[PDB]
Design a protein around this ligand. Sequence first.
Ligand SMILES: CCc1ccc(O[C@@H](Cc2ccccc2)C(=O)O)cc1
Lengths: 270, 270
Amino acid sequence: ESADLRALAKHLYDSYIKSFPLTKAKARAILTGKTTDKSPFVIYDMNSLMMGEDKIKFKHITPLQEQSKEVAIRIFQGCQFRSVEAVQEITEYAKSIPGFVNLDLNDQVTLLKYGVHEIIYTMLASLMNKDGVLISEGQGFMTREFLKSLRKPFGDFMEPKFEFAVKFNALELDDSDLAIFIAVIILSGDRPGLLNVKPIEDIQDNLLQALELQLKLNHPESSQLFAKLLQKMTDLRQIVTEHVQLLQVIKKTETDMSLHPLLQEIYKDL
Amino acid sequence: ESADLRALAKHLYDSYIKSFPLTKAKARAILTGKTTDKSPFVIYDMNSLMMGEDKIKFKHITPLQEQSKEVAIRIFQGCQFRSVEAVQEITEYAKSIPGFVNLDLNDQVTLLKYGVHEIIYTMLASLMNKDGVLISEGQGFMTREFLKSLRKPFGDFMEPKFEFAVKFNALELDDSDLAIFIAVIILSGDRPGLLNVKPIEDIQDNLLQALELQLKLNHPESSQLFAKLLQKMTDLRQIVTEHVQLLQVIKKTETDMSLHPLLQEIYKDL
Ligand SMILES: CCc1ccc(O[C@@H](Cc2ccccc2)C(=O)O)cc1
């Protein structure tokens, strides 16, 4: 029944909104869009950041650059904090996906453990454009150029996410679309360690049919878009893998410090 | 028009028959040990490998190989030959894809360059089953176990293909299906370097439409096969990567091993 898919599409969309503060419709308005009623603090240099941390509303540390930790490190770590927030938002979202909670708890955890990273770069693209990503709930805008001027290890961290985003945003998907796409990602039946795949693929099968209709009705002139969106998952996977690869390198930089025990603890690997 | 799409399916399936001597249909006919019109000799150990040169067309060594390229070298030097064989074949199938020959020559080359191996492993699955894979146009069958027991490095070149094949063959796809899917793989667009992506995406778009209808008509009861298949493209990707790494590793461990030209040109780094 197309009444079930259309229903599901709306459902997920409703939960996506109630779960994700910064939506693409929003982030778009702030970005390249106009909407001149409140402009984001731009960060394009070692000064913008400095003269922007004490001013903006960030959670980690105050702006101080004088032989006290490196700017890059404080930035990278900022991503962690925010992603950890994201993981929480996503975890609540999956909970609204029909059948998700009725699954083995060990599977839910597994489905989340591996889907969180892919869902994160998918949405980050909602906040990105060719020249930078919105920052701090959208209060800021760290340029893409400043990110590349970062330290040797941290300067090639967001580029692959920028290139992904640039091609991804070309599909011109709106939140109602990403809502179901994000659902398809969580209900991935190929995650290592699952104990009962049948129910996981049944849900995804259902989500896939839902995405297909949503896209056809939402983009009648966009040909075989369903196909293309499912193809960007290969990029997501490479974006995710490549990320753990640049993570180990970072792990081969900062380590032993008897002050991190509790902070390093809050940050596992997702 | 469905007629136009069905026409293109027939066309591609037709060239598929014309460019690949060993179709999945023949392979399964051989693998399902019933049609004894011609059964395969099985390789599951050295002794069998020896008797391999016997009733199978081989221009390699028959007796001992310790003092003349061990078993692993014999198996993979042969595996290179088939790969080149496979590329050439796909290069032929490719020219038959409506439009491919009309694209910028450079793109043609780039499409084959990244498309070649994804297709090889796709079709390679047609010759596989949980316990092994067919060799020498079907005349032989080398055990997955013999393969996994090869010398430290070589020992793990095939296992990941087998893992892919078991999942992929699960879709129970047939030749006419792989035909449109093999075309969809070549006509990508995200291949690194392509000059004109639009003409390429316009074709793949058509191929995708052609693959969708086919799957519906051919597998009515198989829900979401189109998408499940399209997601297998991610699986293929990673495999190519695992392959390149191992390859890069052999180049060092075996200074005497010589990758084939048509294969070195295809392969690069990063
Ligand atoms: C002799 C080293 C080697 C070369 C190629 C190779 O894989 C083939 C492809 C292949 C792999 C396994 C069965 C058939 C073809 C390629 O990289 O073109 C594996 C090992």
